[PDB]
Amino acid sequence: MQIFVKTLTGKTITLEVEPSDTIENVKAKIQDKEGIPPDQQRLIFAGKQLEDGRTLSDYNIQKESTLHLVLRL
Template sequence: MKIYIITERARTITLEVADSTEIMHIKLQIMINEGTPIELQKIVFNEEELEENRTLKSYNIVNESTLYLFRLERQVGEADMTDERKVFETFENL
């Protein structure tokens, strides 16, 4: 079946999936296509945040359903090395 995922930037991602596909697999596909880390993804269907260990079928998601992707903000202390380098470079340039 085909599902659509609308991003915050109004971009549509189309995925071919089975109703037995887990939400974690959807998040992995989004990470591959969009570069958004799994831990920063929030996927919503019918105003409900989807849990990673559940399947599309468990949420009654059917062919041509639309899901919504929100990017969560990193929490303090979760910056990766690239982000840390940017911070140090910014301070060095002041």
């Protein structure tokens, strides 16, 4: 499925992910797309931070969902 991740600066990145893919898979996709390390990225879905062990289906992430990416130092 196609998903969109928005950062705090307004930049939106489109990725191809599956519902069974974990949040770590989304972090790896974002690292491939932009170069941000997975440990420096925080993913939020529906106002709640997504866990790396949990998947997109566990977080009820559907097609064309809007995830939130937060940078960390």
